[PDB]
């Protein structure tokens, strides 16, 4: 029954931040392409005292589309991912999934 306290602690912890980048994320329609998603994710990585770890896949799809994943080194850890036509696009959609996972997480 410990992990109930763990999941509530993590929800309160990543709702306890005071970043304006999170508010800019929340109000903006995040289906927009104008925002620098990988760079903003690195900014929030430097902001909230952890490592964003971009790791590519070693195995392309049956459709030949590249896959990337993002490790959000919190306690517990977030894992997000993206699949894009390039490694840049796979990392872009992976950093995207990281940001709506935070927006899902930071919605108070």
């Amino acid at each position: 029954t410990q992990h109930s306290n763990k999941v509530s602690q993590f929800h309160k912890t990543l709702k306890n931040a005071t970043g304006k980048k999170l508010l800019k994320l929340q109000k903006t329609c995040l289906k927009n392409n104008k925002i620098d998603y990988i760079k903003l994710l690195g900014e929030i990585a430097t902001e909230n005292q952890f490592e964003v770890t971009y790791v590519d896949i070693e195995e392309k799809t049956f459709s030949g589309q590249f896959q990337c994943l993002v490790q959000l080194s919190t306690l517990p850890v977030g894992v997000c991912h993206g699949s894009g036509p390039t490694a840049a696009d796979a990392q872009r959609h992976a950093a995207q999934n990281a940001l709506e996972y935070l927006k899902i997480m930071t919605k108070k």
């Binding site: 992990h3 517990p76 850890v77 991912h81 699949s83």
Partner: protein, 1581 residues
């Protein structure tokens, strides 16, 4: 907590006895059980005609490890058994002639018959294992084709089959009906429905069956976004291409490329499960499920060693974090203040949940069991119901629990499998409290596990097996019961499913033998409920308890369920149906046998009657009448109990409490008097090797002065003993004084002054703080000194007596130097005198002895030491005292013993190394104070007048003054017992551990994992079909299902988702109306005797009746109503260790008071010998004193009532009450041996158990000398009447008084205690040829004759002792559990004496430990198996046979042995009881087959029980571990077992007061406790 008991798995046995039958059960254990029981039950009929009993199976020959059935039947019942391993040559020598059961393959049976080795007429019973297979059908088809069917029914054996449970065989319904037809025509049998399902459906009523439809979920924002989240994670995980070649790329790890698991399959399980939970139950259910999956998946993160596995498991955990955040906001977006969340809860609940909730709303005694075929589904359903019960005020009245079918694998992780079992335990114990209601199970509660009545049963999953649907139906017992299946347009196929299973039910119940009464017969009973008179044993009581027709079957079922027994034996009534056709009217007639434990064993036959239910009500009414007639029912009509029964009333005299009973009581908290000479003749002097003092030996008879006894009371004759003083071994005898002298008063004053000087200053027994008077009526003992004559006589020495009168104050004082100037010297004066050093410490002087006269010793000689030159210088410097003369030689002195108890007539010289030569209370102190050896001066040592040799005679004898007060009480006990007797006259271990664990687990192999095999084949397999054809019978059910479909669609079942004279005339249409009007009269209610009179009139007017044998009633109703079928269904010896040595009755004095005074000695004093030497025989005699009496007085009452009689009469409270009546505690001494304090020659608080330990101890006094017999007379003196009592008048015999004679009454009635009656055989001859059955049953007992080594006279007590409590086919005798009841006390007494009478002479605590370690029920089972008592026993009860098969596997793969059993004894200072207890029961037979002769039992049992008891004797259980168990006020507490890291080792802690805590390791609890005690002893020396 009541129900309706049947003989389930035993109707199968009955129907397996008459008719060719095929049985359908699930376990393979119950198939082997019913198979073994049927082979032994037909074995007697096989053995008389020398036939061959065959078990046909196809799981034979798979292992050289023995097959299960071969194991069962070779070493668990009577039969010598052969199994054919698949590649032996099948020897033809004696494998069927001198072997009863052959378990064969059907091709082996084909080889056996086609070679003409065996005749089918010599084949008794064949049971065909797993005949529901088509492949087994293919083997058994030519066996019936060539051999079985061409044999005539005159030449046929009995055919039984075993089948998988055909109510869910792997077949559509046309194959099912074709299968039932094909098997019932092929195997020549009848199919049988009866399983536990069929039992709870037959005699518990069927619930109302519903299908309830559920509306689909109406998806919204949150649900669709959750579906988007899960489909996103699913699309990414299926978008993976996983390849360990493309990740690891390790060519050298080909084994590890496949051993590394997929990182996807547990993400697949979690995400598929959350998908399904959303898809059906909803997003709230998905939320709680996802939270619980997060609980387990973070544990899987901790467990995970690899890298991509950790990546994907962290991804799954992140998804769960997400889903909790989405559902948490969307369920908290409704959570404003003043808002109830329950509307949103029910809203996001699917209408599957809402429909469940209105189903639960309809139940404002709720008992709801809810299935679901998934465990986390049960957790989330639990969580919904918990949140509902903690929020909904409508549904606030529930207490909900759950469970799982995920017992973990014990080969890896059993520690939480224990917690799984503990969880199920705590849930069920809260459930059956009658204070808790709602359960949410899984398929763990499907079969095997039994749950009480539970009215509302909701199946979540649509059933895919029959068993779950119908067993959920069966868990709904309490009518009105509601079996509701939920469904969310598959309603068509579910209605079709209930139609399929409904025809499966109606093809079950039609294929029974026994039937339930339909609603018509219920209505007929309801109509006729008042037309028959209410039978009352007390009809005068208006508000008395009544038994009508209607409640009589309930009361007979209660009588069968209130007689107590094992939980492995099932006891129930046995009615049968008999059809009699009279006067154009069909009549059903029920007979009614009560089982063999009840002593009504004659059949009760009913009267003919038009229907089933009315006839059954009448037959059970007859049973209630005759059972109250005998007395097996009481006046209040409940069945008898162990505490609700009282025996015959003059025996109840021992159970009224005492005035001291009305620190809990009963628990552990001038006269010529008699003269004799005390002859002390030295027989063996002390050896010079044992003469550690290095002095001369001083014999007692070298002087001519001795002593004598002068008493007014009689002195008995005793055998000669030997006092072992420091001088050696002295034989002590009493010479008969030829002279008897009249008393002289002043010479008695001389004697008394001499005794005062002796017991004050010589022997010093009379201490201060004292009063004493040696002149009283109670004893007149005068111990006097005499002088031996030169002619051999011993004349009285009045000279020394008057000398001691004038000098009874011989006291050295401050001797002046002038008298020691004048003091002379002579060797004869100190030749044999006592020397007295006067110069220091005069008030408490010490007296020393003369040892050697040395002419070379002088005070002028050199002092042995450089401290002083001479003895003069040494004495003068150290004390300032002057020795007058130094010319004389000096004296060698000897120091006295510092201990009175030097007599102890068996050993003091061997006991002399114990304590350093009387322990030196003063010798070591004085030799420390004087340093150099005591060479003393004759001038400083004056003469004591008591001679040295007379002093050495004086120290052997004394301290008898309380012993004379002690050995009068013992002789008084002898006096009253011979007064009321007639007899007598008035004038490595770690290697061992690993080997036994390996052997135990890997050689059991049929543990409770067989129920798990049933579990893993339970809902999954349900297979096997033969064929189907296109016959119209299939088309027949193609309307029947269809019309059943209409029934399901017309019953309201599917739910849309939005004249008493005519009463008697119908009662008796075959009895004419005129006679009924004659018998009516004013009597409005006809008694049963009236219908008996009508039947007696009618059988007198036609004498030819017809008969009928059908149904669940047995052919074991048998002889007393059948087996002749005559239409009468209307009414009715080594002398070494001899127990019967028996010294002659008249001519023996009785109890010699020596052993009485032994038994009058408390162990609180523990003066050498204590009462505990004989107390342990007393209790273990007194059982066999009482029980045989309490067996033979009440010879036909079931034994558990007698057990309460034993437990109240051999109580320590009971023996304490008896000793209160006899007052022995003041006659016994519980004070220490202190002459100062508690020595009163002419209060000792006693524990209440010790008084009991007193009383039975007295029994030992009579128990060698009289033999066993006369102590019973003492028991007859004691007030427990253990002999049959013959009341008489004054016979007046003149040769002798009769043994057993009592005191003359005031009305001159003479009471004679004759011995027990030579008993009646139990052969209650209701049957004409019961002796023919008595020798029919016991084929094969000549081996039981030779192996046991005893020949019986009449086998009546043996085949009582060969009858289990559930063994109803035998109808001569009772169960064996009356010869338990006497066999336990007989072998208890025999073994307790052979422990006591052993020449090695074990200690009292050793005697208790050797009782509780030499013998328990385990060694009874072990030597039972060694003597083949498995191979000779009879029993018909379920569960017991598989349990004791595992136990005898423990004996098998070990091969009998002593090792495992004495090992478990070593933890015992149990898997069966019954096979242990049989060695008691046969023992009771040889108690009364041989007419109460214990010698017969012992000489028979010796050559069989020798090496075990010499092994337990050579194991030496005589350790100080028992004094470490004692020496414990607070100083040896033992902690609880604490299991260590490996589990197979325990550490036991022992805490010791003010000395610390010690801990010991071991392979279990008990060896750890032993090692902890050994460590406590090793560190506590």
């Amino acid at each position: 907590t009541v129900f309706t008991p049947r003989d389930f798995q035993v109707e199968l046995l009955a129907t397996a006895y008459e008719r060719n039958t095929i049985i359908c059960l699930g376990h393979r254990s119950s198939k082997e059980f019913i198979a073994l029981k049927l082979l032994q039950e037909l074995s007697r009929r096989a053995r008389r005609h020398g036939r061959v009993s065959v078990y046909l199976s196809c799981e034979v020959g798979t292992s050289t490890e023995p097959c299960s059935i071969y194991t069962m039947l070779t070493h668990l019942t009577d039969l010598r058994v052969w199994q054919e391993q698949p590649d032996m040559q099948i020897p033809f020598d004696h494998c069927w002639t001198d072997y009863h059961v052959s378990i064969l393959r059907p091709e082996g049976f084909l080889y056996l018959l086609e070679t003409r080795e065996l005749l089918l007429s010599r084949v008794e019973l064949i049971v065909l294992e797993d005949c529901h297979d088509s492949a087994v059908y293919q083997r058994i088809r030519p066996l019936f084709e060539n051999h079985i069917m061409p044999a005539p029914p005159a030449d046929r054996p009995r055919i039984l089959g075993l089948a998988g449970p055909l109510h869910s065989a792997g077949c559509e319904l046309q194959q099912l009906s074709a299968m039932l037809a094909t098997l019932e025509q092929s195997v020549l049998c009848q199919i049988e429905s009866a399983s536990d399902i069929v039992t709870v459906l037959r005699y518990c009523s069927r619930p109302h069956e519903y299908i309830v439809q559920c509306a689909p979920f109406e998806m919204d924002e949150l649900s669709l976004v959750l579906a988007d989240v899960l489909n996103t994670h699913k699309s990414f995980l299926l978008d993976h291409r996983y390849d360990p070649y493309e990740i690891y790329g390790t060519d050298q790890f080909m084994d590890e490329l496949k051993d590394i698991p997929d990182p996807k399959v547990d993400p697949l399980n979690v995400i598929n499960s959350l998908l399904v939970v959303l898809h059906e139950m909803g997003p709230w259910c998905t939320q709680r499920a996802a939270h619980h999956f997060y609980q387990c998946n973070e544990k899987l993160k901790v467990k995970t060693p690899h890298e991509r596995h950790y990546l994907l498991y962290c991804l799954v955990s992140t998804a769960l974090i997400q889903l909790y955040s989405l559902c948490e906001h969307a369920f908290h977006r409704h959570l404003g203040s003043g808002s109830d969340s329950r509307q949103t809860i029910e809203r996001y609940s699917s209408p599957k949940v809402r429909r469940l909730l209105q189903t639960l709303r309809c139940f404002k005694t709720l008992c709801a069991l809810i299935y679901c075929n998934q465990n986390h589904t049960a957790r989330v359903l639990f969580e919904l119901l918990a949140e509902i019960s903690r929020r909904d005020p409508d549904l606030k009245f529930l207490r909900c629990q759950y469970t799982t079918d995920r017992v973990a694998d014990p080969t890896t992780e059993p520690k939480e499998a224990e917690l799984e079992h503990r969880r199920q335990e705590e849930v069920l114990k809260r459930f059956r409290m009658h204070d808790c209601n709602v359960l949410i199970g899984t398929s763990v509660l499907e079969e095997g596990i039994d749950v009480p009545k539970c009215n509302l049963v909701v199946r979540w999953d649509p059933p895919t097996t029959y068993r779950s649907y119908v067993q959920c139906k069966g868990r709904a017992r309490a009518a009105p019961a509601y079996h509701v299946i939920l469904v969310a347009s598959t309603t068509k196929d579910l209605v079709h499913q209930m139609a399929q299973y409904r025809e499966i039910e109606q093809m079950l119940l039609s294929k029974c033998a026994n039937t339930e009464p339909p609603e018509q017969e219920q209505c007929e009973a309801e109509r006729f409920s008042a037309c028959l008179a209410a039978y009352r044993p007390k009809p005068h009581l208006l508000t008395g308890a009544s038994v009508d027709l209607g409640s009589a079957i309930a009361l007979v079922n209660k009588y069968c369920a209130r007689l107590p027994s094992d939980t492995f034996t099932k006891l129930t009534a046995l009615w049968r149906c008999t059809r009699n056709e009279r006067a154009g009217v069909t009549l059903f007639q029920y007979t009614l046998r009560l089982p063999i434990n009840s002593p009504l064993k004659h059949d009760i036959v009913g009267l003919p009657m038009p229907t089933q239910t009315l006839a059954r009500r009448l037959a059970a009414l007859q049973a209630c009448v005759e059972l109250h007639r005998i007395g097996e029912l009481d006046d209040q009509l409940q069945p008898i109990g162990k505490e609700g029964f009282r025996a015959l009333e003059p025996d109840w005299e021992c159970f009224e409490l005492e005035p001291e009973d009305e620190p809990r009581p009963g628990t552990t908290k001038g006269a010529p008097c008699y003269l004799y000479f005390i002859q002390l003749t030295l027989q063996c002097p002390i050896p010079e090797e044992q003469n550690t003092r290095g002095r001369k030996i001083y014999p007692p008879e070298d002087a001519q002065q001795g002593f004598g006894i002068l008493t007014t009371k009689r002195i008995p004759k005793l055998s000669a003993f030997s006092i072992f003083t420091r001088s050696g071994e002295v034989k002590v005898s009493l010479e008969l004084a030829k002279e008897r002298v009249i008393l002289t008063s002043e010479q008695i004053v001389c004697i008394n002054g001499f005794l005062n000087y002796t017991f004050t200053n010589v022997l010093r027994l009379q201490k201060f703080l004292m009063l004493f008077d040696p002149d009283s009526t109670e004893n007149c003992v005068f111990i006097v000194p005499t002088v031996k004559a030169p002619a051999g006589g011993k004349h009285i020495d009045w000279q020394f007596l008057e000398l001691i009168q004038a000098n009874g104050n011989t006291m050295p004082r401050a001797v002046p130097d002038e008298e020691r100037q004048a003091q002379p010297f002579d060797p004869q004066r100190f030749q044999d005198a006592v020397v007295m050093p006067w110069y220091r410490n005069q008030d408490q002087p010490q007296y020393f002895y003369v040892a050697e006269i040395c002419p070379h010793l002088s005070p002028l000689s050199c002092f042995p030491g450089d401290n002083y030159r001479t003895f003069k210088h040494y004495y003068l410097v150290k004390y300032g005292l002057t020795i007058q003369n130094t010319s004389q030689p000096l004296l060698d002195v000897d120091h006295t013993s510092a201990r009175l108890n030097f007599l102890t007539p068996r050993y003091v010289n061997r006991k002399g190394v114990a304590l350093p030569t009387s322990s030196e209370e003063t010798k070591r102190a004085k030799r420390e104070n004087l340093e150099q050896k005591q060479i003393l001066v004759p001038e400083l040592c004056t003469v004591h007048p008591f001679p040295a040799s007379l002093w050495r005679t004086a120290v052997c004898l004394p301290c008898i003054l309380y012993r004379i007060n002690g050995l009068l009480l013992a002789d008084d006990i002898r006096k009253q017992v011979s007064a009321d007797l007639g007899l007598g006259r008035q004038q490595t271990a770690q290697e061992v551990e690993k080997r036994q664990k390996q052997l135990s687990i890997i050689q059991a192999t049929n543990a409770n994992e067989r129920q798990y095999q049933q579990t893993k084949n339970l809902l999954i397999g349900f297979n096997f079909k033969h064929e189907d054809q296109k016959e119209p019978a299939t088309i027949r059910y193609e309307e029947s299902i269809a019309k059943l479909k209409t029934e399901i669609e017309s019953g309201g079942m599917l739910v849309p988702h939005d004249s008493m004279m005519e009463l008697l005339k119908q009662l008796l249409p075959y009895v004419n109306e005129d006679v009924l009007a004659k018998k009516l009269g004013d009597r409005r209610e006809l008694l049963l005797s009236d219908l008996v009179e009508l039947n007696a009139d009618w059988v007198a007017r036609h004498e030819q009746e017809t008969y009928n044998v059908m149904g669940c009633g047995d052919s074991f109703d048998n002889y007393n109503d059948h087996h002749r079928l005559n239409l009468d269904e209307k009414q009715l010896l080594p002398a070494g260790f001899s127990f019967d040595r028996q010294p002659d009755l008249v001519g023996h004095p009785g109890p010699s008071p020596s052993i009485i005074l032994q038994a009058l000695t408390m162990s609180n004093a523990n003066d050498g010998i204590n009462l505990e030497r004989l107390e342990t025989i007393g209790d273990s005699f007194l059982k066999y004193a009482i029980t045989t009496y309490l067996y033979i007085t009440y010879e036909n009452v079931h034994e558990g009532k007698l057990s309460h009689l034993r437990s109240k009469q051999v109580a320590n409270l009971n023996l304490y009450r008896l000793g209160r009546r006899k007052r022995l505690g003041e006659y016994m001494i519980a004070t220490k041996f202190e002459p100062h304090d508690n020595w009163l020659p002419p209060q000792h608080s006693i524990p209440d158990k010790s008084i009991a330990d007193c009383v039975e101890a007295l029994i030992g006094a009579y128990l060698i000398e009289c033999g066993p017999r006369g102590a019973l007379l003492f028991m007859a003196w004691l007030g427990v009447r253990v002999l049959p009592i013959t009341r008489q008048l004054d016979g007046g015999n003149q040769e002798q008084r009769i043994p057993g004679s009592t005191k003359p009454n005031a009305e001159n009635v003479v009471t004679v205690y004759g011995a027990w009656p030579t008993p009646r055989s139990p052969l209650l001859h209701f049957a004409p040829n019961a002796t023919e059955e008595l020798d029919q049953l016991l084929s094969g007992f000549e081996e039981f004759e030779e192996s046991l080594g005893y020949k019986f006279r009449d086998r009546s007590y043996l085949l009582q002792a060969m009858t289990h409590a559930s063994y109803t086919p035998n109808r001569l005798t009772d169960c064996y559990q009356r010869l338990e009841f006497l066999g336990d006390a007989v072998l208890d007494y025999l073994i307790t004496r052979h422990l006591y009478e052993d020449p090695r002479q074990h200690s009292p605590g050793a005697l208790t430990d050797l009782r509780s370690a030499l013998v328990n029920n385990t060694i009874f089972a072990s030597l039972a198996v060694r003597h083949g008592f498995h191979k000779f026993f009879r029993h018909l009860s379920p569960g017991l046979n598989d349990v004791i098969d595992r136990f005898v596997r423990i004996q098998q793969e070990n091969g009998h042995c002593i090792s495992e059993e004495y090992y478990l004894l070593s933890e015992e200072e149990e898997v069966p009881k019954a096979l242990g207890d049989v060695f008691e029961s046969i023992a009771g037979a040889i108690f009364l087959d041989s007419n109460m002769s214990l010698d017969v039992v012992w000489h028979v049992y010796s050559n069989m029980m020798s090496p075990e008891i010499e092994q337990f004797s050579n194991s030496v259980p005589k350790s100080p571990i028992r004094e470490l168990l004692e020496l414990e006020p607070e100083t040896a507490k033992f902690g609880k077992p604490e299991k260590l890291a490996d589990g197979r080792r325990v550490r036991v802690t022992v805490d010791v007061f003010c000395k610390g805590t010690f801990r010991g390791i071991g392979r279990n609890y008990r060896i750890a406790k032993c090692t902890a005690a050994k460590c406590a002893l090793r560190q506590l020396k």
